[PDB]
Write a protein that binds this ligand. Structure first.
Ligand SMILES: CCCC(=O)OC[C@H](COP(=O)(O)O[C@@H]1[C@H](O)[C@H](OP(=O)(O)O)[C@@H](O)[C@H](O)[C@H]1O)OC(=O)CCC
Length: 513
């Protein structure tokens, strides 16, 4: 009865009878706690419908022991799982029941398989679907859709074996007149060899969106004649504007600080035909801290009296605002400015991925379809080396790792904001976005594992794991926006202000009924 449902490949690893779950909203409820290789399940027939708590082990970052027998209090002895999904779960065990240690140990083992030399559930998950999500994204075909390779832009195979840049995809689009040996020189000037490459091209103006990492200028004004020519080549392809725009996602202070560490930005002297703009979007450590502050004000209980000022102090929505405002500036420079833009950050993987993809969503209605959005994720995030496994910490017990940051979560939040402002512009619904966020942590699928395309290939995820798109695409009805259709040629111009943006209740505050 209180036994959990099981996915093909899932197994019960431990079970504790008469454990009390301390629900923050309804109160204590005694039932059975079960741990599988995929989830934590709690069910009690001591209510009606039975009470059911079902969470993927992947959302657990920590597990803490609460009390000892040296605790006389009612439900003072037990466990608490701190979760990535904007909650914490607290259970109470009876010392004489001798279940706490066992549950604690099995949780530490199965929620953090990587740390315990076990596989992530995605490799054990053996269900089969009608569609194969791994066949969804085809680089060459996406470029074709964009009218890519052409006269101005060619496809180079120089990174066919990730020699040029190992955090980059295999195929890269660069200016038709720039030879590979030259790409190699630009690569030594750009951080981690993440040179400027095409993300999107306007079908009418030929203004483009390129992306890259910061130029290694350093404390002395080191210049790269080839990088300068490369950017000039980017500009010479767009026959319109007599200038290019470089959007550095960082606040100026951080760009200057990077220069001090060896990196930097494109100066007015070195890049004569480029205008650089700082977008004031802070780093991963700042975003991690903003979410931490938000979780503490939304979960368990909100203090309504100071909601607005408490929300303000998190600076969550301010970050969302700066990210959307930056994407907006990029889209507008390309669309109404007919100007090409180069987008970067320090590393070019985090903020840069947020910026290109959001601008792209505004500009191209294709990315607003369910399949096109899946392509966008596979393209700008996965193939371009947003370090997913490190930013999420899949199956790793090191909860304090400073590499963990809600970068993709912020992106999805921004997508949801547009979805609110344009209720008929997207083919997918909110449920689709929340589902993506749940599986970002679940590790049921192989879609968000590994930190680069090269890694996913070496680990052969297409053949060893199931794609999230396989699940989603073979089951559309749930993720389709019924209002969709009344748009999708035109550019989206969301408004980025503290008065037009909201806190995504459906996601951050979904645990209270
Ligand atoms: C030096 C002592 C203090 C210290 O740790 O400074 C670190 C700074 C980090 O600079 P930041 O831009 O403030 O911070 C970086 C960005 O958040 C980057 O994202 P994105 O792709 O959006 O750029 C993350 O991937 C990096 O892990 C993070 O370090 O980097 C540098 O100074 C230059 C690196 C060559």
């Amino acid at each position: 009865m209180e036994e959990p449902p099981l996915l093909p490949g899932e197994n019960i690893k431990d079970m504790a009878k008469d454990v009390t779950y301390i629900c923050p909203f309804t109160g204590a409820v005694r039932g059975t706690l079960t741990v599988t290789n995929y989830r934590l399940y709690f069910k009690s027939m001591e209510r009606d419908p039975p009470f059911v708590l079902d969470a993927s082990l992947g959302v657990i970052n920590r597990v803490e022991k609460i009390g000892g027998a040296s605790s006389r209090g009612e439900n003072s002895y037990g466990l608490e799982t701190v979760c990535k999904d904007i909650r914490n779960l607290r259970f109470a065990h009876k010392p004489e029941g001798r279940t706490r240690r066992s549950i604690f140990e099995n949780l530490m083992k199965y929620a953090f398989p990587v740390s315990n030399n076990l596989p992530l559930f995605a490799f054990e998950y053996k269900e089969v679907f009608p569609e194969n999500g791994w066949k969804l994204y085809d680089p060459l075909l996406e470029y074709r859709r964009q009218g890519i390779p052409n006269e101005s832009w060619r496809i180079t195979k120089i990174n066919e074996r990730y020699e040029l840049c190992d955090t980059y995809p295999a195929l890269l689009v660069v200016p038709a007149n720039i030879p590979d040996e030259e790409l190699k020189r630009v690569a030594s000037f750009r951080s981690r060899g993440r040179i400027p490459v095409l993300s999107w091209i306007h079908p009418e103006s030929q203004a483009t969106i390129t992306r890259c990492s910061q130029p290694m200028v350093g404390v002395s004004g080191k210049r790269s004649k080839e990088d300068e020519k490369y950017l000039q080549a980017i500009m010479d392809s767009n026959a319109q504007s007599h200038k290019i725009f470089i959007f550095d996602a960082r606040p100026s202070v951080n760009a200057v600080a990077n220069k001090a560490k060896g990196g930097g930005y494109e100066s007015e002297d070195a890049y004569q035909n480029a205008e650089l703009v700082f977008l004031d979007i802070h780093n991963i450590h700042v975003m991690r801290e903003s979410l931490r502050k938000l979780k503490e004000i939304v979960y368990p209980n909100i203090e309504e009296t100071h909601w607005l000022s408490n929300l303000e102090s998190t600076h969550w929505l301010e970050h969302i605002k700066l990210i959307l405002a930056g994407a907006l500036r990029i889209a507008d420079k390309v669309e109404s400015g007919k100007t090409s833009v180069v987008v970067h950050s320090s590393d070019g993987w985090d903020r840069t991925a947020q910026l290109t993809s959001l601008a792209m969503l505004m500009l191209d209605g294709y990315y607003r379809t369910i399949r096109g959005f899946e392509v966008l994720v596979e393209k700008e995030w996965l193939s371009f080396g947003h370090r997913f496994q490190l930013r999420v910490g899949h199956g790793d017990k090191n909860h304090a790792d400073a590499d963990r940051s809600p970068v993709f979560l912020q992106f999805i939040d921004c997508v949801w904001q547009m979805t609110r402002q344009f209720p008929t512009a997207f083919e997918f619904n909110e449920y689709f976005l929340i589902t993506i966020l749940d599986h970002l942590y679940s590790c049921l699928f192989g879609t968000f594992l590994c930190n680069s395309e090269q890694q996913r290939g070496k680990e052969n995820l297409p053949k060893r794991t199931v794609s999230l798109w396989s699940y989603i695409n073979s089951q559309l009805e749930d993720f389709t926006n019924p209002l969709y259709g009344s748009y999708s040629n035109h550019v989206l111009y969301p408004v980025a202000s503290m008065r037009h943006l909201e806190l995504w209740v459906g996601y951050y505050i979904r645990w209270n009924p």
